[PDB]
Amino acid sequence: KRIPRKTKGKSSPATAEPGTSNCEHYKARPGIASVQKATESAELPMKNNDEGTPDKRGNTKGALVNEHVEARDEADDATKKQAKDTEKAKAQVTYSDTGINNANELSRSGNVDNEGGSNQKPMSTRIAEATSAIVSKHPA
């Protein structure tokens, strides 16, 4: 037999015994549909936060927003999505505009590379120009 691969790789007198019945006479108090749906929703894994990490060629996967502003942006996005989860336009649980002053919290973004510099230009471009500086040709 074989098992399909999920992700891409580099290939790209017997008698009915007494006491047996299929009838049901009991219904669950907690329930079996509601609890099963709640557990199904809770079983999902945690989102892979891939921003700020290198890609195969070296460029940093991400967006160019400032770190603090971009963290505040995702906080506001989570606040928005909580309302959609709770069915109401407004939200009671808020991950934004809480009383605590967090002007120092930071989230990973594509603005910064791995060495402390800035990804204004992606690394591949940077190495390309650095190598294109020293080159030579055949004499005329």
Binding site: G9, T20, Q36, N48, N49, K56, T98, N104
Partner: protein
């Protein structure tokens, strides 16, 4: 029906499929209940048509993968085909003939080539490959895939990337050979050369043409040849099976110990993988113990089975690996609410759907029965039915360590407030009853300071400094360093100037709820991901008592009810004397006291619930969660041990480097701030009722069963070991190329490389991570929170800080990891045999050698090889300046000492010099190397080579082959080094003048298997025979079967053991308790 698990089956003949799970003979989990005919099964997520089945969302690495084929990674290919007349052509049996099959190719030249899994029937294949092209063909594409983002050439490899590329190639070689040897049927033989030996038959209709390949002894000695006399030198009684298992399944044996074609490196890797995988197996009795313990006594389970040993099912990992996975999960957050909001939300939904508490403000409406009463009713808003804040309050207790729940500003008095306003008084009441249910380090400070703010202008308290004032907002007291000394020491509050504030401070210091803890899960068999906490408990910010729903709702032993009563008494004392309220034109004290008494004596059972049942549900869900709780100790008023910072470090404790604080330390609080609704919490607290016919045993035994029938803790445990494996392999493979203090063996130091930087190490780590995920079939996170800045690290570790500066550093230990030490072993093997992979040791010499002699460039005579110790040689460094000679004087270059030597003699060049002056040197040296006397030795260390076989009886010239390489040499990359090797022969050939320009320094032709094997002997050309030492267990008589010399030379015929296991699904009979 089945008489084992009492599961009724639709068809009687279906019993054979069902009993296999129990282990008898003829999907993921199977759960059956003992009081209802509602079975539940779990299937893989990626399958389609999941009718009447439940999904397993969590990722599952594929650990058990079989291989019903010979396990070797070095195949032998012909290079120069040849055919010769032979004496004996075929065997004869009566009126029949059989063709003679040779175990090795009958070519003039043959050599060993690395090809991973070139003959293996595999069910699930790791989609990795290490496929060497034949050396006559260009093979540089596998020294280029990593970190050659841009290259000035296309068919060139960057010489500075060689160590990283070779390490990644070795990692792929290890990862693509992680399979278990499936046991297949045999077949007796009666060939007059292999008499009575039970051979092995591969699956498929072609199970009869593999015999010559696997068993060299099968072919006899028909004529005189190298292969024939090697077979004659071999032994007879070591073929086929050697030892078979005692216990049997049906007629087939369990495991067999068989002689066949294989290689030492792969058989050792697979043996180590088998040992590691079998070291983690578990017992169904252990699983039923685990589930019974996790059920907290409300449910008992049982997992019947039949005695057996072939069962394998790895679900045992270490607390160290659990802690490493927990640390990785914590670092995945990176200070954002998008990854933690769904977890809290759906745990809130689960708690709402499991908890028996039903919340309804009709109790409050009936108690009021309706001015303070109307004002408090309008402020409480009984018409709103959203208590997500209340449920998230309980949900955040588990995840205190990453998120801290606080009270939103709008819940406080609007404008600082005053005790002259009924609305502000009610807001303070709501705040007082809502604050204690928050996982905030300083709740009491806010609670006291709110009343202090409201009571400005009626009574004062001493202040520590002139910067601050009593009339400062209570929302700013979010940090332990802002606790007033008057609140710390009650004696400073003068009773004459603060009779109410002193009473409130005393009440807070006396009746604030005390933290506690509860035992959850099972540490013995499931381990524990608990950090800063013993592995068996789960702390709470409230006290807990044994569960029994018969206690009075009005009960001041319960601390929450006592707190509500004391708050009501404080409000009554505040309002009774009518001072602090000038402007109230009526005697509203008679109504205020009445409504406060009603609130104090309300019928709510939420205080009973939160201390008698809520810990039970929390302890039930806690082991079943995808994200195990990350928690921090709770303290009431001991400010000297209040946590203030949580961080993760990458470096070892015995090093000093740049302080790179993790992003988790940038929050003012312990973690991400979360806001709740004090109004919602108070409304949920002041109401709530159990069903009249509630039975705890029935309710919990009915609610637990669907939860445990949809569990994934086994999958999470199976994934954590892979996570730790990846972490260890990453650190070991980055310390090889970077500069760290991790003690490694450092085998691959002769291969040139560079001092890796942060970006280079990050790219290498990302390639390793994606290769690992590709091999183990993952799609979600695995080892990529560690790629965000400076991946050059030594050890995972976590820590937290108190207010008084005393920290707590937790450093989990790490068991030796099988993939990493197998990579080290294969690197050791490569160090001794680099040639098979296409990499040559040493350095090349460029210079004309015009002679008719026949020797291989890979094994040159010592008469034309020179080094530094040779007299008269010159060594050139970075400073090499060319000067033209005027008026006929010879041009001359500058030596390392300062001398100017002409274009003659023997020279020594580093590769970097020609790399940086690829055009100047090429223009000036071609006319001298080709025609004049000039020998150049380019020190390289290691280089990929591709060689062309020329015909020795005709003229040859390698200048058109060498000038191409010397022109395609470029600063960024290196083309493959050409080599011209004459073809061996048997008949006396006629010699012709052949010229060579590139030769090697030391021996590199160890990949050559044999020359003209069909011929009786080799006369003209390089000489070689079948390597005796590689077939040690045959040629050597006094050698035990299990004798291998792995670090020096791999054997091509070994003792492979094969297994036939079974992995039954999780079966358990959930049983209720009376």
């Amino acid at each position: 029906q089945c008489h084992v698990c009492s599961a009724v089956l639709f068809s009687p003949l279906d019993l054979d499929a069902h009993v296999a799970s129990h282990g008898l003979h003829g999907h993921i989990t199977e759960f059956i209940s003992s009081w209802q005919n509602h079975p539940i099964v779990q299937v893989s997520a990626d399958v389609e048509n999941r009718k009447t089945a439940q999904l397993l969302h969590a990722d599952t690495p594929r650990l058990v993968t079989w291989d019903a084929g010979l396990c070797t990674s070095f195949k032998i290919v012909p290079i120069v085909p040849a055919q010769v007349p032979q004496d004996v052509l075929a065997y004869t049996f009566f009126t029949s003939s059989y063709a003679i099959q040779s175990p090795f190719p009958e070519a003039a030249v043959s050599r060993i080539v690395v090809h991973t899994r070139w003959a293996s029937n595999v069910d699930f294949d790791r989609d990795s490959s290490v496929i060497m092209a034949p050396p006559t063909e260009n093979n540089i594409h596998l020294f280029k895939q990593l970190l050659n983002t841009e290259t000035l050439s296309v068919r060139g490899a960057n010489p500075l990337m060689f160590r990283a590329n070779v390490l990644h190639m070795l990692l792929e070689f290890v990862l693509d050979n992680l399979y278990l040897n499936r046991h297949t049927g045999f077949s007796q033989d009666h060939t007059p050369f292999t008499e009575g030996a039970n051979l092995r038959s591969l699956p498929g209709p072609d199970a009869e043409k593999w015999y010559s390949i696997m068993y060299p002894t099968r072919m006899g000695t028909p004529n005189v040849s190298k292969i024939c006399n090697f077979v004659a030198s071999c032994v007879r009684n070591r073929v086929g099976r050697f030892d078979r298992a005692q216990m049997m399944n049906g007629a087939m044996s369990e495991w067999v110990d068989v002689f066949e074609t294989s290689d030492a490196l792969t058989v050792s890797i697979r043996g180590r993988w088998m040992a590691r995988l079998a070291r983690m197996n578990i017992n169904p009795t252990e699983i039923e113990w685990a589930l019974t313990e996790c059920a907290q006594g409300y449910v008992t389970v049982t997992s019947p089975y039949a005695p057996s040993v072939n069962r394998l099912m790895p679900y045992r990992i270490s607390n160290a690996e659990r802690q490493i996975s927990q640390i990785i999960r914590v670092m995945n957050i990176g200070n954002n609410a998008t990854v933690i909001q769904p977890v809290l939300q759906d745990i809130s939904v689960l708690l709402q759907r499991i908890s028996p508490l039903q919340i309804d403000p009709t109790i409050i409406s009936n108690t009021m029965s309706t001015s303070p009463a109307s004002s408090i009713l309008g402020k409480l808003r009984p018409s709103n039915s959203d208590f997500s804040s209340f449920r998230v309050a309980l949900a955040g207790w588990l995840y205190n360590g990453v998120v801290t729940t606080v009270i939103d500003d709008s819940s406080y008095p609007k404008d600082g407030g005053s005790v002259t306003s009924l609305e502000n008084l009610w807001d303070f009441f709501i705040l007082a009853l809502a604050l204690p249910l928050t996982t905030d380090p300083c709740a009491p400070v806010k609670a006291f300071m709110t009343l202090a703010n409201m009571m400005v202008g009626f009574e004062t308290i001493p202040m520590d400094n002139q910067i601050y004032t009593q009339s400062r907002r209570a929302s700013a007291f979010s940090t332990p360093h802002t606790w007033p000394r008057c609140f710390m020491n009650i004696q400073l509050i003068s009773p004459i100037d603060a009779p109410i504030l002193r009473q409130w401070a005393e009440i807070i210091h006396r009746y604030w709820p005390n933290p506690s803890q509860i035992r959850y899960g099972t540490p013995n068999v499931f381990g524990s991901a608990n950090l800063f906490t013993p592995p068996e408990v789960l702390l709470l910010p409230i006290d807990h008592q044994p569960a029994n729903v018969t206690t009075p709702t009005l009960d001041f032993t319960n601390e929450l009810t006592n707190w509500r009563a004391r708050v009501c008494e404080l409000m009554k004392n505040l309002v009774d004397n009518q001072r602090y309220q000038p402007g109230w034109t009526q005697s509203l004290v008679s109504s205020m006291r009445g409504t406060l008494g009603k609130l104090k004596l309300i019928k709510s059972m939420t205080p009973m619930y939160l201390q008698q049942l809520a810990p039970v549900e929390l302890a039930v869900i806690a082991p079943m969660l995808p994200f195990p709780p990350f928690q921090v100790p709770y303290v009431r008023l001991d400010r000297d041990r209040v946590p203030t910072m949580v961080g993760v470090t990458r470096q070892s404790r015995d090093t000093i480097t740049q302080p790179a604080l993790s992003l988790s330390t940038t929050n003012t609080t312990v973690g991400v701030p979360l806001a709740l609704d004090a109004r919602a919490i108070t409304v949920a607290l002041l109401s709530g009722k159990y069903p009249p016919d509630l039975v705890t045993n029935v309710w919990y035994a009915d609610a637990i069963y669907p939860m445990y029938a949809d569990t994934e803790v086994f999958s999470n445990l199976q994934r954590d070991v892979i996570t730790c494996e990846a972490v260890q392999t990453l650190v070991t493979l980055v310390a090889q190329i970077s500069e760290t203090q991790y003690p490694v063996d450092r085998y691959l130091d002769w291969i040139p490389s560079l001092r890796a930087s942060a970006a280079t190490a990050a790219t290498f780590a990302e390639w390793v991570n994606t290769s690992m995920k590709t091999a183990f079939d993952l799609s979600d996170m695995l080892l990529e929170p560690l790629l965000s800045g400076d991946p050059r690290m030594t050890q995972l570790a976590i820590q937290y800080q108190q207010y008084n500066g005393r920290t707590f550093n937790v450093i989990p230990e790490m068991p030796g990891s099988v993939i990493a030490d197998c990579v080290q072993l294969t690197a050791e093997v490569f160090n001794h045999e680099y040639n098979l992979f296409g990499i040559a040791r040493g350095d090349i010499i460029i210079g004309r050698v015009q002679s008719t002699h026949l020797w291989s460039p890979l094994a040159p005579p010592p008469d034309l090889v020179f080094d530094r110790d040779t007299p008269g040689v010159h060594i050139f460094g970075r400073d090499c300046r060319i000067s033209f000679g005027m008026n006929g004087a010879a041009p001359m270059i500058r030596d390392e000492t300062g001398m100017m030597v002409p274009f003659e003699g023997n020279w020594i060049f580093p590769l970097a010099l020609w790399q940086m002056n690829t055009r100047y040197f090429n223009q000036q040296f071609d006319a001298w190397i080709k025609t004049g006397e000039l020998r150049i030795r380019i020190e390289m260390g290691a280089y990929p080579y591709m060689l062309h076989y020329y015909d020795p009886r005709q003229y040859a010239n390698a200048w058109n082959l060498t000038s191409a390489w010397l022109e395609e040499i470029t600063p960024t990359s290196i083309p493959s080094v050409p080599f011209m090797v004459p073809i061996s022969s048997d008949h006396d050939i006629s010699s012709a003048p052949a010229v060579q320009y590139i030769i090697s320094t030391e021996y590199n032709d160890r990949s050559l298997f044999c020359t003209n094997s069909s011929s009786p002997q080799t006369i003209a050309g390089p000489d070689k025979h079948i390597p005796v030492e590689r077939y040690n267990i045959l040629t050597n008589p006094d050698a035990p079967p299990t004798q291998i010399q792995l670090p020096e030379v791999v054997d091509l015929y070994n003792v492979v053991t094969r297994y036939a296991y079974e992995t039954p699904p999780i079966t358990a009979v959930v049983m209720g308790v009376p």
